[PDB]
PDB file of C-alpha atoms and ligand atoms in Angstrom:
ATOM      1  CA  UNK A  17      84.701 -68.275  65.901  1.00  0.00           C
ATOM      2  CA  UNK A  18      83.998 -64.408  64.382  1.00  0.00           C
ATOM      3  CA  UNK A  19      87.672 -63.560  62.956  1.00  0.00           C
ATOM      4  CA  UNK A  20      86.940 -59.565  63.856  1.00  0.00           C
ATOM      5  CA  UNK A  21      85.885 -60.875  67.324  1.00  0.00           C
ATOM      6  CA  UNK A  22      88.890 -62.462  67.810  1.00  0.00           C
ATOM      7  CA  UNK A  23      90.758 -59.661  66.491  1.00  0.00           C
ATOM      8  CA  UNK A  24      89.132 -56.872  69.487  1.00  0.00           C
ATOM      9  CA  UNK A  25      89.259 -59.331  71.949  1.00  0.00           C
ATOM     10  CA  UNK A  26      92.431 -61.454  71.401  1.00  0.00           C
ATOM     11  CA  UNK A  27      95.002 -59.960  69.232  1.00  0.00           C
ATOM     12  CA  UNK A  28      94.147 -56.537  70.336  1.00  0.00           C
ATOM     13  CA  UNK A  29      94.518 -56.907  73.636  1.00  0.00           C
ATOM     14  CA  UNK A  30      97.342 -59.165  73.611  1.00  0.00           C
ATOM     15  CA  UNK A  31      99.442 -56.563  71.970  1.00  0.00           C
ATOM     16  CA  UNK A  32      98.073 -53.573  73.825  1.00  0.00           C
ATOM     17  CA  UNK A  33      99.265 -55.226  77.372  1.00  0.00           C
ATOM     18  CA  UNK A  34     103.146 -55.503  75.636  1.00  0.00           C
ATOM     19  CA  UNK A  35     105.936 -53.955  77.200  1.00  0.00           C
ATOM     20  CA  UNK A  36     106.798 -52.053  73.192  1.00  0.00           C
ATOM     21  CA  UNK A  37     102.999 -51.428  72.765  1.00  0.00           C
ATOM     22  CA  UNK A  38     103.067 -47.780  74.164  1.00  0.00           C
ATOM     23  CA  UNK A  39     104.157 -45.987  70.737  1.00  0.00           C
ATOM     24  CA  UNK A  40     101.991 -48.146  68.984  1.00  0.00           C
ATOM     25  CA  UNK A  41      98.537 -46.808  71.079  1.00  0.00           C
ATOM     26  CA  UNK A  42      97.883 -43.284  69.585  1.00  0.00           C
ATOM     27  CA  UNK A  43      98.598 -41.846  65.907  1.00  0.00           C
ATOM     28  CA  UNK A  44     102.451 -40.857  65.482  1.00  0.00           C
ATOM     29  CA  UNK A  45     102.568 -37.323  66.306  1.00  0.00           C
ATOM     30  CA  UNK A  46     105.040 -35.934  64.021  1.00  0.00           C
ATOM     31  CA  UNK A  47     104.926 -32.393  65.060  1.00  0.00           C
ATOM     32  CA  UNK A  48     105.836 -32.818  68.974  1.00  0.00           C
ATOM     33  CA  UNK A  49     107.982 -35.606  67.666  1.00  0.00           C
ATOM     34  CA  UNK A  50     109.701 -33.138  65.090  1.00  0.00           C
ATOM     35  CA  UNK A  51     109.477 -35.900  62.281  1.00  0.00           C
ATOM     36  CA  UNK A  52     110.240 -33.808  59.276  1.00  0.00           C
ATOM     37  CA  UNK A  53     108.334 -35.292  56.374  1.00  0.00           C
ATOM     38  CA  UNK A  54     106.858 -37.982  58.485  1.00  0.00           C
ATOM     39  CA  UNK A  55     103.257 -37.196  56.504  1.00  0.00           C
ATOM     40  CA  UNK A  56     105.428 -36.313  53.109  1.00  0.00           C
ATOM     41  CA  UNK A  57     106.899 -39.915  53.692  1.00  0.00           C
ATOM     42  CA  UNK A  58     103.409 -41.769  55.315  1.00  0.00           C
ATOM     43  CA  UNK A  59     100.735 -41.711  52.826  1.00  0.00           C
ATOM     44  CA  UNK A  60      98.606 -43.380  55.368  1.00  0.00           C
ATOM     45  CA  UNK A  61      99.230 -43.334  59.453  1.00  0.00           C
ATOM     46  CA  UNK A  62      97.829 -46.010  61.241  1.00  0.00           C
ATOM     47  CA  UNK A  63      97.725 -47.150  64.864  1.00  0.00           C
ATOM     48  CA  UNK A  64      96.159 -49.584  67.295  1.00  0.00           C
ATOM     49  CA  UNK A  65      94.349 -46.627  68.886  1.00  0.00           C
ATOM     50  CA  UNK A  66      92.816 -45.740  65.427  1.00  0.00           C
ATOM     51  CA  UNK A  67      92.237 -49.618  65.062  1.00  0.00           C
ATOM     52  CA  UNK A  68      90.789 -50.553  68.386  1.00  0.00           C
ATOM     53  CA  UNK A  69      88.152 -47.364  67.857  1.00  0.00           C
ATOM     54  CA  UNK A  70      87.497 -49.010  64.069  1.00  0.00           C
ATOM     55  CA  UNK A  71      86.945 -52.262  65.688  1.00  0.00           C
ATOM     56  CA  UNK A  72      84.773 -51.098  68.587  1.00  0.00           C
ATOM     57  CA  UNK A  73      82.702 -48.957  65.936  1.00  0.00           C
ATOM     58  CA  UNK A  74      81.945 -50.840  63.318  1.00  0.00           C
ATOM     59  CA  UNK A  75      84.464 -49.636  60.551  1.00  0.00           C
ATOM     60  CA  UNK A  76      85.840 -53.033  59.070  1.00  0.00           C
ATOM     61  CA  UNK A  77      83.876 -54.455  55.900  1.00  0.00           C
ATOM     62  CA  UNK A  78      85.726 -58.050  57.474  1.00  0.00           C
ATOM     63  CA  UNK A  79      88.752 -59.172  59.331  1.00  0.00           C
ATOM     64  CA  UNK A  80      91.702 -58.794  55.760  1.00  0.00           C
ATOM     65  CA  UNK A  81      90.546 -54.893  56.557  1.00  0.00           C
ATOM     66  CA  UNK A  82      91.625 -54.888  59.558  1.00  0.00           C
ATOM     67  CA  UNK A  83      94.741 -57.460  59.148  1.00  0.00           C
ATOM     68  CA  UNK A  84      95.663 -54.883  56.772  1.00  0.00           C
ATOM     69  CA  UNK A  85      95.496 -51.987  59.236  1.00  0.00           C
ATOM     70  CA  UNK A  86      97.897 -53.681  61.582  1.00  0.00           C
ATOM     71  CA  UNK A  87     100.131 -54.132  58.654  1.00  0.00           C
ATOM     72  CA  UNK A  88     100.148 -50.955  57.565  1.00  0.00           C
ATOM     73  CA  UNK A  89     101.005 -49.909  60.785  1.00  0.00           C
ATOM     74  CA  UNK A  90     104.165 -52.149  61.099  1.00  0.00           C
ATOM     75  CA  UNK A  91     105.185 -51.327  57.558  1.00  0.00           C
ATOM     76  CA  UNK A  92     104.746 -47.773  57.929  1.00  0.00           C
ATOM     77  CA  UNK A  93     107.258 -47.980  60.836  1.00  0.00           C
ATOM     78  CA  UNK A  94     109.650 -50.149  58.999  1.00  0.00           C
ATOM     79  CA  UNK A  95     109.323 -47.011  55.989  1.00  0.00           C
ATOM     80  CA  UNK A  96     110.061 -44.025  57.990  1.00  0.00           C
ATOM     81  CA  UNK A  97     112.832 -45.398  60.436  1.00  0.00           C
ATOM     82  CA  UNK A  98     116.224 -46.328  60.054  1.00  0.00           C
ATOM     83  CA  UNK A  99     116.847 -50.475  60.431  1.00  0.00           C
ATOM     84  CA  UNK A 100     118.130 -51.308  64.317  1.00  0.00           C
ATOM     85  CA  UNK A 101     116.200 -48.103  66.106  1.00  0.00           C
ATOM     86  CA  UNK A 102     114.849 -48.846  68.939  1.00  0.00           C
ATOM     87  CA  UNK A 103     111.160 -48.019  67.748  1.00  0.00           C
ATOM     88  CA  UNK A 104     112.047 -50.388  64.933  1.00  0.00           C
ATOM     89  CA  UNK A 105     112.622 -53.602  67.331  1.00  0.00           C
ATOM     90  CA  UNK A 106     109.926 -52.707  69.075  1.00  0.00           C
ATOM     91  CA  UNK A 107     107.526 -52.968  66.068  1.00  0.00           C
ATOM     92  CA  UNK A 108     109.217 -56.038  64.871  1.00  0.00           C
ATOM     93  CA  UNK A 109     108.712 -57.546  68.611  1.00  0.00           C
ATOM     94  CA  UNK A 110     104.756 -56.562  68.279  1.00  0.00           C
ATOM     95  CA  UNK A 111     104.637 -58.140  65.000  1.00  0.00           C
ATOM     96  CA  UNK A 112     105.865 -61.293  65.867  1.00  0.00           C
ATOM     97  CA  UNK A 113     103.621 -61.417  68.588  1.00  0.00           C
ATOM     98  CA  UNK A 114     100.565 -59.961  66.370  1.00  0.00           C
ATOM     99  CA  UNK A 115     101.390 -63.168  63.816  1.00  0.00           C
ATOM    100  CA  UNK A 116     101.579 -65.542  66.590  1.00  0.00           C
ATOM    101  CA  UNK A 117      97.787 -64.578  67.923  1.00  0.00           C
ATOM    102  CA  UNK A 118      97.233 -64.793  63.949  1.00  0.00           C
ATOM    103  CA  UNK A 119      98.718 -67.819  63.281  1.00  0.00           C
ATOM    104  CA  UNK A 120      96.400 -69.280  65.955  1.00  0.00           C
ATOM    105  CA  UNK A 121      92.850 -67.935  64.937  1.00  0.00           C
TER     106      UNK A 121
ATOM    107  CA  UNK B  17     103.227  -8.154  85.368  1.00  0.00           C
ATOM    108  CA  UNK B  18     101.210 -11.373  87.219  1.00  0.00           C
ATOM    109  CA  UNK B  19     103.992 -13.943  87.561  1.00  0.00           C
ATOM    110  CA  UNK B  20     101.199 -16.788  87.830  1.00  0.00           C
ATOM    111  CA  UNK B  21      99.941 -15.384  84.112  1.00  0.00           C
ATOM    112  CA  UNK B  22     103.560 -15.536  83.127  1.00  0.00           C
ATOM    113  CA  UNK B  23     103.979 -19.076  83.861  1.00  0.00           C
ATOM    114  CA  UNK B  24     101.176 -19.812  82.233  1.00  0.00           C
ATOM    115  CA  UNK B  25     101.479 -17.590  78.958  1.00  0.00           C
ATOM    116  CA  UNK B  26     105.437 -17.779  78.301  1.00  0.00           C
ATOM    117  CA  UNK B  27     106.776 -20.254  80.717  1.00  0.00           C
ATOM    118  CA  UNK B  28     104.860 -23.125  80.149  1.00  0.00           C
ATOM    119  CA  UNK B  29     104.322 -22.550  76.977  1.00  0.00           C
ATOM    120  CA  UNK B  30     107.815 -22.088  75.642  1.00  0.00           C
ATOM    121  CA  UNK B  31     108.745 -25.050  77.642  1.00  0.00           C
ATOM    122  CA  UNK B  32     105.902 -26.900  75.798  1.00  0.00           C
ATOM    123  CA  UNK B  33     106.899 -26.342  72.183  1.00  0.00           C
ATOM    124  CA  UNK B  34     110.450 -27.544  72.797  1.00  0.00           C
ATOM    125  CA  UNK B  35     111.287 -30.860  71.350  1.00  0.00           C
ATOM    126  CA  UNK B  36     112.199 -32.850  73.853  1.00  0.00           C
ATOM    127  CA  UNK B  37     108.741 -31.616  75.785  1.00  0.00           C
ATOM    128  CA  UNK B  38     106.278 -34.513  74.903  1.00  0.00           C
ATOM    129  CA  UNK B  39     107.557 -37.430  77.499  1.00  0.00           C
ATOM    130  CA  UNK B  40     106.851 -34.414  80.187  1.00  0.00           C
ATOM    131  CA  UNK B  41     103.219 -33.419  78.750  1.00  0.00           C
ATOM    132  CA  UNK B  42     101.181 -36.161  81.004  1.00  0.00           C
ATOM    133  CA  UNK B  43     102.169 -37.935  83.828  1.00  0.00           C
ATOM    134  CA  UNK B  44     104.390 -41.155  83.206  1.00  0.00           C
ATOM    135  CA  UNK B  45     102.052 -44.234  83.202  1.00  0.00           C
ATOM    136  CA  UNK B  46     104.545 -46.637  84.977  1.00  0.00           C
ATOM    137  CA  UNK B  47     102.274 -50.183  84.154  1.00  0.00           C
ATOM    138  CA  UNK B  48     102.428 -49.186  80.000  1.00  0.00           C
ATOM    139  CA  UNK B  49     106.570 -48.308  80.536  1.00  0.00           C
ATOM    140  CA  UNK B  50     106.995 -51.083  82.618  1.00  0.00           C
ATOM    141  CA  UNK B  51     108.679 -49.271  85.642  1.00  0.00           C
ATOM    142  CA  UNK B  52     107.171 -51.534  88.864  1.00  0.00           C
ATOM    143  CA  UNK B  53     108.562 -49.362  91.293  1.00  0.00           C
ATOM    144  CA  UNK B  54     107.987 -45.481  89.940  1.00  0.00           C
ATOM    145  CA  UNK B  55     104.812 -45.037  92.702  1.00  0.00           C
ATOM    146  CA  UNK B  56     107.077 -46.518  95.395  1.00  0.00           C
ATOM    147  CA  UNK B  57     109.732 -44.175  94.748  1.00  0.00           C
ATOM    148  CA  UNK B  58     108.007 -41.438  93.455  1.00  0.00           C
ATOM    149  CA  UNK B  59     105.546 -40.016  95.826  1.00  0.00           C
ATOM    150  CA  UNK B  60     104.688 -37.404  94.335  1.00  0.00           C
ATOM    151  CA  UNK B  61     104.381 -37.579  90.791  1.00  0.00           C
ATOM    152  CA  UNK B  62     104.293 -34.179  88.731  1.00  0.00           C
ATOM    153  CA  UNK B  63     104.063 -33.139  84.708  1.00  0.00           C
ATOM    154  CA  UNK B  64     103.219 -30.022  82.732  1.00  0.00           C
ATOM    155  CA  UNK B  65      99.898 -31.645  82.157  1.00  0.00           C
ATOM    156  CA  UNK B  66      99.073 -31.176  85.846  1.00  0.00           C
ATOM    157  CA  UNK B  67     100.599 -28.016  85.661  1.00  0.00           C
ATOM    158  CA  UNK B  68      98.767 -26.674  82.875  1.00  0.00           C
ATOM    159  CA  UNK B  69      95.882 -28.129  84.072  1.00  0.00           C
ATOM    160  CA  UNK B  70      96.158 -26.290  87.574  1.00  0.00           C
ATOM    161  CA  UNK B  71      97.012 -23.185  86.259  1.00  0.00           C
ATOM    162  CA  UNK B  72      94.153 -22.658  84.035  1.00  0.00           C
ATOM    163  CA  UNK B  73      91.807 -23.852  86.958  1.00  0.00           C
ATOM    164  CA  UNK B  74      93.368 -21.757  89.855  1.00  0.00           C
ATOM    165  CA  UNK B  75      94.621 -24.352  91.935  1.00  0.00           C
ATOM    166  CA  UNK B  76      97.986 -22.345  92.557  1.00  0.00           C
ATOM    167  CA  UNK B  77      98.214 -20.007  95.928  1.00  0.00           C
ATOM    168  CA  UNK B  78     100.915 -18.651  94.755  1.00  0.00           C
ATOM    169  CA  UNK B  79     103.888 -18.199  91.008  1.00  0.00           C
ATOM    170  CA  UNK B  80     106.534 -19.825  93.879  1.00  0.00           C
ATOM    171  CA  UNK B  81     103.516 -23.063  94.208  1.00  0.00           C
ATOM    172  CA  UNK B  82     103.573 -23.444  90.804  1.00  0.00           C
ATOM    173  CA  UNK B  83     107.330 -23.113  90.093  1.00  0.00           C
ATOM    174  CA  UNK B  84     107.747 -25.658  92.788  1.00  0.00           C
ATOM    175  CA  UNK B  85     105.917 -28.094  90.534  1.00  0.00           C
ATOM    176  CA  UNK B  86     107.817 -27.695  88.062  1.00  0.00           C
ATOM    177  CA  UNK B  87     111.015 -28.509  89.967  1.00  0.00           C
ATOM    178  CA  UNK B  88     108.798 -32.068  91.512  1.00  0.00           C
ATOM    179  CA  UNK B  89     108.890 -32.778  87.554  1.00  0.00           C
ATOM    180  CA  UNK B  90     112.646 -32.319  87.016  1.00  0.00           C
ATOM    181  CA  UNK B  91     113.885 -33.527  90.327  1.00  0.00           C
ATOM    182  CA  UNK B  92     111.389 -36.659  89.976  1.00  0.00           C
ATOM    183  CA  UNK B  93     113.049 -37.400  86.844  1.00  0.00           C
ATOM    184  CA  UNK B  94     116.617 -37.066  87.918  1.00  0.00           C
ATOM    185  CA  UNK B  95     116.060 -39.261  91.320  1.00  0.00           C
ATOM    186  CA  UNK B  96     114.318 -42.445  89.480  1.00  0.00           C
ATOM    187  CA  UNK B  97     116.454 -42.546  86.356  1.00  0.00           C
ATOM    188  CA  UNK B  98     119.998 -43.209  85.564  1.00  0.00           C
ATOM    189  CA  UNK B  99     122.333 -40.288  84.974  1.00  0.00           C
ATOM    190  CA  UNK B 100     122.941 -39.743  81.277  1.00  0.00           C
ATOM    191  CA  UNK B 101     119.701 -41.466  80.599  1.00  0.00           C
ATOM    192  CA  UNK B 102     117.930 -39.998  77.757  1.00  0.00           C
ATOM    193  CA  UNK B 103     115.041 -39.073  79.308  1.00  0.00           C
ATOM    194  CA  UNK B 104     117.349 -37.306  82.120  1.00  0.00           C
ATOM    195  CA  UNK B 105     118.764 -35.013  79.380  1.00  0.00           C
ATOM    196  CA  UNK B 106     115.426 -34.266  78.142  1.00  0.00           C
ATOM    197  CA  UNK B 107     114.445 -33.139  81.595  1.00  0.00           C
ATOM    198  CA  UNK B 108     118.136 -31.066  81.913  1.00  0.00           C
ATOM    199  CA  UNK B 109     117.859 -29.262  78.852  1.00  0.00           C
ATOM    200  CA  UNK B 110     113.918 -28.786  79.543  1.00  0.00           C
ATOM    201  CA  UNK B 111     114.880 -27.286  83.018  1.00  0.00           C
ATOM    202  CA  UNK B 112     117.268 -24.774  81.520  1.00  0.00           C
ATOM    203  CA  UNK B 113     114.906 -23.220  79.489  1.00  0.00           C
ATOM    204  CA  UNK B 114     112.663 -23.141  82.636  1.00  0.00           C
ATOM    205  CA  UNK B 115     115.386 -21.085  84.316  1.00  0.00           C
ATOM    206  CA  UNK B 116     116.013 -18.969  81.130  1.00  0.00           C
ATOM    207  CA  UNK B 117     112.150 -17.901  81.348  1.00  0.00           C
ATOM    208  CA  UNK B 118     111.893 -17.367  85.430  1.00  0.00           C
ATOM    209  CA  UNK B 119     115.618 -15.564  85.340  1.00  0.00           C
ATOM    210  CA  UNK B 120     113.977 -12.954  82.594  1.00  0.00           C
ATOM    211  CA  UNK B 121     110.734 -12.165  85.168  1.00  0.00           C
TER     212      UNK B 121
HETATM  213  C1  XR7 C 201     104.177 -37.324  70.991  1.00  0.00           C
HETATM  214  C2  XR7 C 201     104.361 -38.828  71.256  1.00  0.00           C
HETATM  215  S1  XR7 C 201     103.192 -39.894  70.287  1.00  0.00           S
HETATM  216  O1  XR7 C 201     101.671 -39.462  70.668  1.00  0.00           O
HETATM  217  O2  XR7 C 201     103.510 -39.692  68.699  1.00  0.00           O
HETATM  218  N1  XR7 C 201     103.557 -41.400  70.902  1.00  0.00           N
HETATM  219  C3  XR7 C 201     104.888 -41.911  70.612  1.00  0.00           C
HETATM  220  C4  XR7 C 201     105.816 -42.029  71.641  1.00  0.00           C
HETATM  221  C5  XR7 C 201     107.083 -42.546  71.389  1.00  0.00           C
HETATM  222  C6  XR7 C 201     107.437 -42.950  70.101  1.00  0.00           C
HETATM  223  O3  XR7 C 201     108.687 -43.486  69.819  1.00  0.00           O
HETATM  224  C7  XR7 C 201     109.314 -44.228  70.833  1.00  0.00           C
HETATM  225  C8  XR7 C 201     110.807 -43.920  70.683  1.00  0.00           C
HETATM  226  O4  XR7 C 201     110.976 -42.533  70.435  1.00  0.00           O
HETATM  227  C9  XR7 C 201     112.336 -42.083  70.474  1.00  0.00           C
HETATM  228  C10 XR7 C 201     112.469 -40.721  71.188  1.00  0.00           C
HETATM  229  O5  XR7 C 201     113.254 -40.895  72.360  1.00  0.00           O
HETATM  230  C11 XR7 C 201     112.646 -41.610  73.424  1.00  0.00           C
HETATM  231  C12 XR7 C 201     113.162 -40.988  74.737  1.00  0.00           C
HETATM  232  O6  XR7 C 201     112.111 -41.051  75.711  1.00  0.00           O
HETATM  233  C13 XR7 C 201     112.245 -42.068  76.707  1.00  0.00           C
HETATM  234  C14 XR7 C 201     110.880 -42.495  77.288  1.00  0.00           C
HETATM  235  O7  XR7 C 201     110.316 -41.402  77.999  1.00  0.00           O
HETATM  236  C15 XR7 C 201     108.903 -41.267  78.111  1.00  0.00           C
HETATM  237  C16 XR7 C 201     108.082 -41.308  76.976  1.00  0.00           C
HETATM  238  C17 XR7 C 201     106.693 -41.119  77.037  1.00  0.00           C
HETATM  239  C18 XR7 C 201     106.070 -40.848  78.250  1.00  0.00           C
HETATM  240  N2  XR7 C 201     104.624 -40.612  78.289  1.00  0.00           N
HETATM  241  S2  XR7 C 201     103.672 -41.787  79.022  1.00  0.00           S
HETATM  242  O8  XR7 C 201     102.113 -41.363  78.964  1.00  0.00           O
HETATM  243  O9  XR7 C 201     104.199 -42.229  80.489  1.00  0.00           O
HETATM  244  C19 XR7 C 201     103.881 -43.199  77.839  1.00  0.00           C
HETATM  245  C20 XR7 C 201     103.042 -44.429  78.207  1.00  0.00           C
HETATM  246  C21 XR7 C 201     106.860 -40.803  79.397  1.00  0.00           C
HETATM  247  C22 XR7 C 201     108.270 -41.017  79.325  1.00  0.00           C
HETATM  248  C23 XR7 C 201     109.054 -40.907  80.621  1.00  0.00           C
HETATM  249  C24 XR7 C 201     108.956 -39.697  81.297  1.00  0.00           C
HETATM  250  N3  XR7 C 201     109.584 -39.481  82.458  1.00  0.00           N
HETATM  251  C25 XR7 C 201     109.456 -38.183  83.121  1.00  0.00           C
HETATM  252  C26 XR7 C 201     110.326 -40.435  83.000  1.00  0.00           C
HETATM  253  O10 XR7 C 201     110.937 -40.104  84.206  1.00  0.00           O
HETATM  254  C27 XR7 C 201     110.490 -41.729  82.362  1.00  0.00           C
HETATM  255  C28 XR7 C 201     111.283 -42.770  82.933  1.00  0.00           C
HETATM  256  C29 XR7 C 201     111.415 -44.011  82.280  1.00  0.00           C
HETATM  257  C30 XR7 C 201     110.757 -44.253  81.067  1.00  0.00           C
HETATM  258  C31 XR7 C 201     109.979 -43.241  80.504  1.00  0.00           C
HETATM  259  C32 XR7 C 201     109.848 -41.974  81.161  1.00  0.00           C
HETATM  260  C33 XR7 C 201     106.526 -42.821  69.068  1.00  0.00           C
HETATM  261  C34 XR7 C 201     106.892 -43.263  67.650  1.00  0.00           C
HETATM  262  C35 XR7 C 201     106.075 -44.219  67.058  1.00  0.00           C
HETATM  263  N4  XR7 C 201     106.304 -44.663  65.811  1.00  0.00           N
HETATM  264  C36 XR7 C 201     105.412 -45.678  65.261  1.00  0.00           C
HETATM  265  C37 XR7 C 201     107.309 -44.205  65.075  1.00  0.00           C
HETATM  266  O11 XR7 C 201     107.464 -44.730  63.788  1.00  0.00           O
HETATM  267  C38 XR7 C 201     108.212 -43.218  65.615  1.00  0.00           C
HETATM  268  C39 XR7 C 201     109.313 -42.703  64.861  1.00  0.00           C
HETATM  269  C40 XR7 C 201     110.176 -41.731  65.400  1.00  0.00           C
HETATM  270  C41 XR7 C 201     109.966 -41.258  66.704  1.00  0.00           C
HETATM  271  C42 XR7 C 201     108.883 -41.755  67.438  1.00  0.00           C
HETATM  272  C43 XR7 C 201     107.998 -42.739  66.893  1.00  0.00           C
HETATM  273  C44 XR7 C 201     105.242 -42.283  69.326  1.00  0.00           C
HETATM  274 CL1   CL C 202      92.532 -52.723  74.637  1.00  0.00          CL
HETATM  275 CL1   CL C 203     109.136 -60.010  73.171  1.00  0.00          CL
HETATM  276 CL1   CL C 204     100.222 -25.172  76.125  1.00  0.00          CL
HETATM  277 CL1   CL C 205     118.204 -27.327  73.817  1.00  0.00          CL
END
C-alpha cells in the first residue's frame, strides 16, 4: 500500500473530520489573531490545508516529507503556546490520533 | 453623506480590524465546531462576510436593511450561546463599536 496514498486518503481525512481539527485547516493567521511575533517565533508555518494542497499536487519527494509537515505543524503549536491552552490540547488530541492512523500504515 | 457607503467604508470596516472580529468574518460552520443544533435554532444565520459581501453587490434596499444584519449577527450569537461565553463577549464588545460608528452618523 502507497504510504503518501494512505497519508491523503486515511490520515488526512481522519484528522480533518475531528472535532479540534478546525484551527488546524488553514495557515495560522497571526495578524487577525494579533499573535505578536508569531512569524519572529515560527520559522516555518505549517497546516493541514497547506498539506492536503501538497498532497493533492504533487509536492512530497515521499511520505518522511510529509510526516514531517504534520510534525512541524504540531511542534510549531507546542513552540508558540503556553502548556494547558486550549489550542494546545487540541493539537496534542490530533496528534495522538495522527500517530494512531500512523502506527497502523 | 450615503449611510449605505458609510457602513461599508467605516462601519464595517472598523468593526473588521478589531481583534476579536475573525470568529464573525464568515458564517459559523456548525458540522467543523460541532454545534448539532445551530441550523435548528438559528434560522437565520448572519456574519460580516455576508454583509460585506451584500454591500459591495447591492443587495441592501436600504442603511436600516443592512444595520439590521448586523444586529441578526449579534443577537444570533447571544440567543445560541451561554452568557459570559467567550465568543458572547467577542460579539458584546464587537457590537459596541457598531453603536460607536452608527451613533457618530
Ligand atoms: C483568523 C483565524 S485562523 O485562519 O488563523 N484559524 C484559527 C482559528 C482558531 C485558532 O485557535 C483556536 C483557539 O483560539 C483562541 C481564541 O479564542 C477562541 C474564542 O472563539 C471561540 C470560537 O468561536 C468561533 C471561531 C471561529 C469561527 N469561524 S468558523 O468558519 O465557523 C470555524 C470552523 C466561528 C466561531 C463562532 C462564532 N460564532 C458567531 C458563534 O456564535 C460560535 C458559537 C460556538 C462556537 C464557535 C462560534 C487558531 C490557532 C491555531 N494555532 C495552530 C495556533 O497555534 C494558535 C495560537 C493562538 C491563537 C490561535 C491559534 C487558528
Ligand atoms: Cl480532506
Ligand atoms: Cl479525542
Ligand atoms: Cl473589509
Ligand atoms: Cl474593546
Amino acid at each position: 500500500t502507497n504510504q503518501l496514498q494512505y497519508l491523503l486518503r486515511v490520515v488526512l481525512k481522519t484528522l480533518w473530520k475531528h472535532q479540534f481539527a478546525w484551527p488546524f485547516q488553514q495557515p495560522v493567521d497571526a495578524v487577525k489573531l494579533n499573535l505578536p511575533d508569531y512569524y519572529k517565533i515560527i520559522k516555518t508555518p505549517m497546516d493541514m490545508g497547506t498539506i492536503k494542497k501538497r498532497l493533492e499536487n504533487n509536492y512530497y519527494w515521499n511520505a518522511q516529507e510529509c510526516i514531517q509537515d504534520f510534525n512541524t505543524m504540531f511542534t510549531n503549536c507546542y513552540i508558540y503556546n503556553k502548556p494547558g491552552d486550549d489550542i494546545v490540547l487540541m493539537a496534542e488530541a490530533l496528534e495522538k490520533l495522527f500517530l494512531q492512523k500512523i502506527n497502523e500504515l
